[PDB]
Amino acid sequence: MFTGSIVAIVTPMDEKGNVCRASLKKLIDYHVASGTSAIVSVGTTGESATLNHDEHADVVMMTLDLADGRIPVIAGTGANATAEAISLTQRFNDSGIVGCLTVTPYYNRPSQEGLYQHFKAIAEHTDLPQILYNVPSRTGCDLLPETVGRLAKVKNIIGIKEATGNLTRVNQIKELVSDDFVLLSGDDASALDFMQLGGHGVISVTANVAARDMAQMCKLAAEGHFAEARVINQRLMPLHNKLFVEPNPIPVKWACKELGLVATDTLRLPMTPITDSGRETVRAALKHAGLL
Amino acid sequence: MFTGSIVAIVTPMDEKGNVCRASLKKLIDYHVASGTSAIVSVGTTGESATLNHDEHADVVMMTLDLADGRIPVIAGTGANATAEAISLTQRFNDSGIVGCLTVTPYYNRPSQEGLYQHFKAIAEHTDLPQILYNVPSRTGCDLLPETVGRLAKVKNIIGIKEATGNLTRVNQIKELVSDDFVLLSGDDASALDFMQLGGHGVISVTANVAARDMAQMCKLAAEGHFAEARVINQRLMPLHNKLFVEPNPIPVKWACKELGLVATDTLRLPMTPITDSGRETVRAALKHAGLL
Ligand SMILES: NCCCC[C@H](N)C(=O)O
Ligand SMILES: NCCCC[C@H](N)C(=O)O
Ligand SMILES: NCCCC[C@H](N)C(=O)O
Ligand SMILES: [Cl-]
Ligand SMILES: [Cl-]
Ligand SMILES: [K+]
Ligand SMILES: [K+]
């Protein structure tokens, strides 16, 4: 649903740069097999920026079809224009999607008031649960805990993906929102720490290629078995880091291909192919995790 | 024209958020009469993010039509997807614009090699001059001088809007490009310093409301009369700063309204109306500049 290991799934593409169904089907089966709790479709790692609105909707609907009720699917619906965010969201109303992941507007650097009005308006145009998403390093914008508190009062604003890697945010937000508001890490390297502080899970890039370990680690964390969970975290830490050796999702797409999970590691410009050095780095990280 | 005071023009809107032709005409006539070198149409200050592709093109074409040959128009054509950038550019080929201002992809954080391939691909499918645009605070991405140097070898890549406010970039870039390559400030508050170091002009937010003073300041700077330019700059400095007291273009649209240059200060979400405290700040800066 909205806890545990949630995969920020890649959009696998053929050499032409269009979604590859066979690869998408292989990935989804793998997540179902591995115990992944849910899939985020066409979020950041799914190359949301470079899919047009129709292409974006198609990938989400295809993911939902292929999941075939076996695993929940959350749609990426973020946009930096409120009217676009509303349109994208309306696309998935009454679709089978369990919720939306919606990022703070990027580039235009809205005020906290603007963030409030943006997300409130979006929530008002849907019955679907909304997970806010803060990632200042990508957006130029930082959704502060006070504003998260203000927004958590909206009935269908139910959680946040917190990707700052600033762990003080966990308890700053938790103090301002109801006990059923969900706190999800958006930073693999700090996600276990985030859970140890009271977070409920992670929207993970690492989970694309270590789905079983990620699921197990989040289960252990949820049970309060943090020392056990850390053994797994330490095995995965090189992946947590080196999957960003080059811009995400360049490394994780290559890793998927290397593991036979997808047919090609093709991306859309301005993402470009992994370097030879990046290949060796990511391979060593996979070896360390015992995946290769 | 790619030197001197270039205005990063507002997209004046009515109360419903639709482009106001009468207000835009007034602004263009003001810039013609006040000595502005050129108009950037639908750039960052023009709310590029919240205009759809069709609306974007409409504003550029309206701006050309109204300019009626009296002032050069540069079109904002930036996108975080290389396909979108190319498509936008194709709409404006043979339109009458003199060039394009194209920002580094935002949100997806491409590598330097990605930036290279993005801008090379855009430049390839047009004869129009391209001005690169670097603004890490908005994009999450920093186009480094090394890569600017590489790109400058492409025939129609002819300049950069450098909005870091990091003044070391001026001569780091200058050393790597030909004498013909234009270096334009994208930070009003450091723009005169930027020109004193070798820069050729400024793509200015302040120029929306202080067009004549900006024009004179930049001419004095081009002539090496830095102490003289600095007197003007010091009267404008409150505005250079306070036009960002709330997210651009909120303050500057309000200021335009206050001077009678536009009918309404309306924006599109996620921009929201100026606060009262913001009104007071901006008003005081306008008075300091001798404009009210
Ligand atoms: N995936 C939907 C369309 C994205 C449009 C644009 N590239 C943006 O990032 O906002
Ligand atoms: N102005 C063209 C359409 C823009 C699409 C999207 N809002 C972006 O900022 O990239
Ligand atoms: N108008 C579309 C142009 C094609 C660009 C596309 N991004 C590519 O990789 O080829
Ligand atoms: Cl995501
Ligand atoms: Cl601009
Ligand atoms: K709520
Ligand atoms: K050139």
From Swiss-Prot, chains A, B:
GO biological process terms held by the UniProt record: diaminopimelate biosynthetic process; lysine biosynthetic process via diaminopimelate
Q: Where are the residues marked L-lysine inhibitor binding as a site? A: A49, N80, E84, Y106
Q: Where is this site: Part of a proton relay during catalysis?
A: T44, Y107
**How is this chain's activity regulated?**
Is allosterically regulated by the feedback inhibitor (S)-lysine. Is inhibited by pyruvate analogs such as 3-fluoropyruvate, 2-ketobutyrate, glyoxylate, and beta-hydroxypyruvate. Is not inhibited by its substrate, (S)-ASA.
Q: Which residues form the active site?
A: Y133 (proton donor/acceptor), K161 (schiff-base intermediate with substrate)
Q: Does the record carry Cytoplasm as a key word?
A: yes
Q: Give one GO term, molecular function aspect.
A: 4-hydroxy-tetrahydrodipicolinate synthase activity
**Name of the top EC class for this enzyme:** lyase
Q: Which GO terms describe its cellular component?
A: cytosol
Where can this protein be found?
Cytoplasm
UniProt EC number:
4.3.3.7
Q: What is the effect of changing L197 to Y/D?
A: 1.4 to 2.5% of wild-type activity. Decrease in affinity for pyruvate, but nearly no change in that for (S)-ASA. Exists as a dimer in solution
Q: In which pathway does it act?
A: Amino-acid biosynthesis; L-lysine biosynthesis via DAP pathway; (S)-tetrahydrodipicolinate from L-aspartate: step 3/4
Q: Does the keyword field hold Amino-acid biosynthesis? A: yes
Q: Which UniProt keywords apply?
A: Allosteric enzyme, Amino-acid biosynthesis, Cytoplasm, Diaminopimelate biosynthesis, Lyase, Lysine biosynthesis, Schiff base
Q: What is the effect of changing T44S?
A: 8% of wild-type activity. 4-fold decrease in affinity for pyruvate, but nearly no change in that for (S)-ASA
Outcome, altering Y107W: Reduced activity by 95%. Reduced affinity for both substrates. Exists as a mixture of monomer, dimer and tetramer in solution. Has significantly lower thermal stability than the wild-type enzyme
Q: What is its main location?
A: cytoplasm
InterPro entries tied to this protein: Aldolase_TIM (IPR013785), DapA (IPR005263), DapA-like (IPR002220), Schiff_base-form_aldolases_AS (IPR020625), Schiff_base-form_aldolases_CS (IPR020624)
The UniProt function text for this chain reads: Catalyzes the condensation of (S)-aspartate-beta-semialdehyde [(S)-ASA] and pyruvate to 4-hydroxy-tetrahydrodipicolinate (HTPA).
**Family label:** Belongs to the DapA family.
Protein name in UniProt = 4-hydroxy-tetrahydrodipicolinate synthase
Report which gene this protein is encoded by: dapA
